[PDB]
């Protein structure tokens, strides 16, 4: 494991080969989880891009958070999708924490600490454990088929994922930088495999 603290990956030029591969020790399939991350880019006023790509062998889009141009944040699980519309786009680092639970289908979406209304998805579904997680490319196959129009140019960090829903308090602690313990993906014990033009630098965001 390598401590990524106070550091971030940089994707300086749009391309279809620069990507980072993450490795999950996960064994049991997930009924629930909470993804939290911090990303920065100016592409908003331009084509769409993929923030986080989770793909099992039987579905390229098990979980994909995606910014859709003029639309906003697009969350999808198990092949379904819902859109969290955004009226106007600013230009600044943004933190986002999203939860989904298989029992109730409730999805929570916290942007910069401010929660969006809860909605429903795929009640009763289950997520396989054996998967590939990639940063900087939307994969339409298990480990390839990265399209150039969808790659991310910019910065990403603090990537963290649990196997259960955090309470609002815990999310507030995370957004404020307090101590916590990831159990499926730890930024502080991360294990990865870089590919192409990606570098490691100090984080810009506070």
């Amino acid at each position: 494991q390598t401590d990524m603290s106070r550091k971030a990956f940089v994707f300086p030029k749009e391309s279809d080969t620069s990507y980072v591969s993450l490795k999950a020790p996960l064994t049991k399939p997930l009924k629930a989880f909470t993804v939290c991350l911090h990303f920065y880019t100016e592409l908003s006023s331009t084509r769409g891009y993929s923030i986080f790509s989770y793909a099992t062998k039987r579905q390229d889009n098990e979980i994909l958070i995606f910014w859709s141009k003029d639309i906003g944040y697009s969350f999808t699980v198990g092949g379904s999708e819902i859109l969290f519309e955004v009226p106007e786009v600013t230009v600044a680092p943004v933190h986002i924490c999203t939860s989904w639970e298989s029992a109730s289908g409730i999805v929570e979406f916290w942007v910069d600490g401010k929660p969006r209304v809860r909605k429903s998805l795929k009640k009763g579904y289950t997520v396989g454990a054996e998967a590939s997680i990639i940063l900087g490319q939307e994969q339409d196959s298990f480990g390839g088929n990265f399209e150039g129009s969808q790659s991310l140019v910019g910065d990403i960090g603090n990537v963290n994922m649990w196997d259960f829903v955090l309470s609002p308090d815990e999310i507030n602690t995370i957004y404020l930088g307090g101590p916590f313990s990831p159990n499926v993906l730890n930024w502080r014990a991360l294990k990865y495999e870089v590919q192409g033009e990606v570098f490691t630098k100090p984080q810009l965001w506070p």
Partner: nanobody
Amino acid sequence: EVQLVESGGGLVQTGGSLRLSCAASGRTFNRHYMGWFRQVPGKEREFVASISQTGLNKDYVDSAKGRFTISRDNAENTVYLQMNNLKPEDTALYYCAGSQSSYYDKPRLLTEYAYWGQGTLVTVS
């Protein structure tokens, strides 16, 4: 609320290709999912495919997968259905429909759909 029109139909020999297109009149087009349905004389309409609003999630019928492709261009707000290796049975009317001003997954029924186009004819010789 959009108004749907279709084009690209006609007759072709087996093994050909057809890039059918559908145009939408309105400004909320990007807020509606799209779909292609099939109809034959002496029967009702039949699900063919569908396209995501954002344009990242699709759904094909069992016969259409591997042979047909569906895409959408939001800027020009037009839906494209490219079919290849056409078969004689694949000769009927086709309708481009779509109706979820809101946000949800891709269904495969008819009640949810609300708006329909005039239709087009496709024939395989």
